[PDB]
Amino acid sequence: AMKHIHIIGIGGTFMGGLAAIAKEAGFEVSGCDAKMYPPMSTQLEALGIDVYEGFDAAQLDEFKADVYVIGNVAKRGMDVVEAILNLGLPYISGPQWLSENVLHHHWVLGVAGTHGKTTTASMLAWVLEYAGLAPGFLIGGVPENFGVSARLPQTPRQDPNSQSPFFVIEADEYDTAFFDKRSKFVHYRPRTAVLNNLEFDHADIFADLGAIQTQFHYLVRTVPSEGLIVCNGRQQSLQDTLDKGCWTPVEKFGTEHGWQAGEANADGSFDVLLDGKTAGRVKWDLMGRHNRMNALAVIAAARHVGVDIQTACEALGAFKNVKR
Amino acid sequence: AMKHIHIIGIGGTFMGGLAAIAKEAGFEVSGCDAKMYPPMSTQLEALGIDVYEGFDAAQLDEFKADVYVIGNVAKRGMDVVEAILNLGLPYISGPQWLSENVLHHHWVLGVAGTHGKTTTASMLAWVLEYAGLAPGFLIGGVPENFGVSARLPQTPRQDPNSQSPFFVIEADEYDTAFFDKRSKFVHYRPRTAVLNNLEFDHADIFADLGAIQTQFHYLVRTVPSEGLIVCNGRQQSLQDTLDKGCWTPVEKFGTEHGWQAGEANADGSFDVLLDGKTAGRVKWDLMGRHNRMNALAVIAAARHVGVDIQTACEALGAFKNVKR
Numbered sequence: 001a002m003k004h005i006h007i008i009g010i011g012g013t014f015m016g017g018l019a020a021i022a023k024e025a026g027f028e029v030s031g032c033d034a035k036m037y038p039p040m041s042t043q044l045e046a047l048g049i050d051v052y053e054g055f056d057a058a059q060l061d062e063f064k065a066d067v068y069v070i071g072n073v074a075k076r077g078m079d080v081v082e083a084i085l086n087l088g089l090p091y092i093s094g095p096q097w098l099s100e101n102v103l104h105h106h107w108v109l110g111v112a113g114t115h116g117k118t119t120t121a122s123m124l125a126w127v128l129e130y131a132g133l134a135p136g137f138l139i140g141g142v143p144e145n146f147g148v149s150a151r152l153p154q155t156p157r158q159d160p161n162s163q164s165p166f167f168v169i170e171a172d173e174y175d176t177a178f179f180d181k182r183s184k185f186v187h188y189r190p191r192t193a194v195l196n197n198l199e200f201d202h203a204d205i206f207a208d209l210g211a212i213q214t215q216f217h218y219l220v221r222t223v224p225s226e227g228l229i230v231c232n233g234r235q236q237s238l239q240d241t242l243d244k245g246c247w248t249p250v251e252k253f254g255t256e257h258g259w260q261a262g263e264a265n266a267d268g269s270f271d272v273l274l275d276g277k278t279a280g281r282v283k284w285d286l287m288g289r290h291n292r293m294n295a296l297a298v299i300a301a302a303r304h305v306g307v308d309i310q311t312a313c314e315a316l317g318a319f320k321n322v323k324r
Numbered sequence: 325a326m327k328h329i330h331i332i333g334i335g336g337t338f339m340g341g342l343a344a345i346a347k348e349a350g351f352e353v354s355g356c357d358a359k360m361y362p363p364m365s366t367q368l369e370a371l372g373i374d375v376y377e378g379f380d381a382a383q384l385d386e387f388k389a390d391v392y393v394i395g396n397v398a399k400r401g402m403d404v405v406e407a408i409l410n411l412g413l414p415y416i417s418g419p420q421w422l423s424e425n426v427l428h429h430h431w432v433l434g435v436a437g438t439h440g441k442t443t444t445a446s447m448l449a450w451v452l453e454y455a456g457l458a459p460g461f462l463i464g465g466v467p468e469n470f471g472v473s474a475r476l477p478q479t480p481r482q483d484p485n486s487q488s489p490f491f492v493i494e495a496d497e498y499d500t501a502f503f504d505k506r507s508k509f510v511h512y513r514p515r516t517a518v519l520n521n522l523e524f525d526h527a528d529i530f531a532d533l534g535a536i537q538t539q540f541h542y543l544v545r546t547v548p549s550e551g552l553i554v555c556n557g558r559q560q561s562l563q564d565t566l567d568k569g570c571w572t573p574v575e576k577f578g579t580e581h582g583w584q585a586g587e588a589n590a591d592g593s594f595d596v597l598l599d600g601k602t603a604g605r606v607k608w609d610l611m612g613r614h615n616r617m618n619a620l621a622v623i624a625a626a627r628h629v630g631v632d633i634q635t636a637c638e639a640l641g642a643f644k645n646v647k648r
Contacts, residue, residue: 076545076569076571077571082548082549082571085513085546085547085548085549086548086549086550088428088515088548090428104412104414178545179510179542179545179546180506180510181506181538181542182504182505182506186503186504189409191412214505218503218505221400221502221503222409222503223409224406224409224410224412225406225409225410226410245400247400247401247406
């Protein structure tokens with residue numbers, strides 16, 4: 001008999017993805033949040049997932065759940081949180097729940113960094129899908145190439161009789177929950193880790209990069225030595241992070257000796273360089289040095305799971321930006 | 325049969341105590357550590373726990389455990405740890421394992437602080453035993469009133485067909501694991517929390533006094549509103565910690581307006597005072613103020629579970645010292 005989870009703070013792109021995946025993995029899913037509105041509310045409704053309005057402790061009798069999965073938004077003060085702790089009811093964070101029930105089975109490709117995460121994860125998920133690797137993912141927005149923001153791994157083109165091991169996740173650096181101050185990404189145990197960039201600490205704009213770099217260093221501590229770190233080579237803040245300790249091969253991007261994007265064209269195509277040698281060419285309709293940097297990360301990452309550079313470049317040719 | 329856990333870093337009282345508890349809870353237990361010695365080595369033998377010498381990866385070939393329980397001594401670079409991560413073997417921290425499999429099923433009374441944790445936790449365990457509550461416990465030494473440093477809750481005097489719900493644990497402020505930088509005590513969810521004191525003596529594990537304050541605040545975040553925080557009231561560092569946020573009644577010891585210990589007599593006995601009123605009298609052979617201070621925390625915690633001041637004062641008279 002499959003379990004009933006009930007999410008405190010079901011709203012937002014993250015727990016919405018976590019609920020979809022949970023439902024798809026055969027759990028029974030219910031939750032609460034502040035009143036929500038289309039598209040997220042009807043979408044959740046369309047999955048057979050009842051949604052309580054508010055944080056009234058009464059919902060515990062109506063939703064006699066097996067475990068309470070707690071979102072970012074939950075805090076001491078809320079009646080349902082207080083009732084959970086008082087009654088000694090089982091509770092667990094979103095990230096930890098996802099990792100225990102889903103990610104720990106999988107080859108996880110995590111995309112961390114302070115900026116460009118959603119796009120880069122979208123580009124990674126697409127490359128893998130284009131390459132026949134049917135990835136699972138959980139991303140902070142509906143990528144234009146798929147219908148949906150979260151799914152389990154599907155059937156690879158070249159082994160119908162089994163499930164893909166690959167799962168792409170946007171790896172948030174924000175707190176896990178009110179009772180787990182560490183970054184979300186600390187739970188995912190990614191085997192392919194993209195460190196997109198490290199720009200500033202959202203929680204204190206006047207702060208030293210120190211505390212955020214530590215969180216990042218804790219991510220690096222969970223990556224196998226047979227894994228790979230795909231790191232932005234143009235930022236002292238990531239190099240300082242790596243300098244604290246690293247046990248895994250690193251590929252830099254945006255550098256002469258690592259992966260580099262060539263000069264862009266009239267049509268917006270550009271050469272992908274590895275250690276200074278031409279390896280491929282991306283002809284897509286995205287513009288911006290930052291998108292070119294993203295593509296570099298995605299290519300290196302995809303290679304690690306066995307995607308040819310050539311196949312990666314054709315994939316990005318069909319990548320679409322999200323439409324307003 | 326029941327699950328098999330393999331403890332990486334099974335030496336030391338905390339992980340050895342964890343192994344005894346796991347053993348008694350029906351788990352198959354084995355582990356590894358550096359060359360161990362009596363009395364610990366023979367205690368693990370008496371429990372039938374296979375113990376591998378060293379941290380060589382080759383041990384993983386002997387059998388596959390259901391989960392790998394990682395103690396504090398584990399860190400990256402160590403051969404068995406690198407292999408655990410590369411092979412994607414399941415792994416969990418000692419504290420979290422103890423919490424998920426034992427502590428969350430119980431009423432946890434957690435003893436925290438920079439000093440006196442071992443003594444206070446022992447006193448508290450003993451007071452509970454004396455009152456007929458057959459508590460479980462995990463303590464960092466062997467209390468002389470008991471045979472052991474750890475045990476499940478036993479059957480209480482009043483409910484011979486029942487298990488007691490009380491578990492007393494020494495709530496350590498040092499890290500959970502190389503992959504969980506939080507203090508061990510954030511996994512425990514105590515319903516009765518003793519905060520014995522707070523000085524900066526962990527010079528190196530913590531940047532300063534503030535980092536320990538933050539962890540303590542994170543402890544306070546998990547205490548239910550119907551719980552109790554029993555807190556040293558002579559200390560500013562603790563007051564500052566509470567002002568970060570508290571959602572639970574607090575009782576202060578060592579102050580006039582809270583719990584106080586009167587002057588000691590020509591033999592060691594003292595009055596226990598509440599608000600300025602005599603509540604009881606302890607007849608002791610123990611020395612110094614630090615112990616009478618501990619006594620006050622213990623009586624406060626004991627009262628939270630329903631032990632009468634009188635009975636607790638009495639019990640302390642029968643209290644013998646701790647070992648190791």
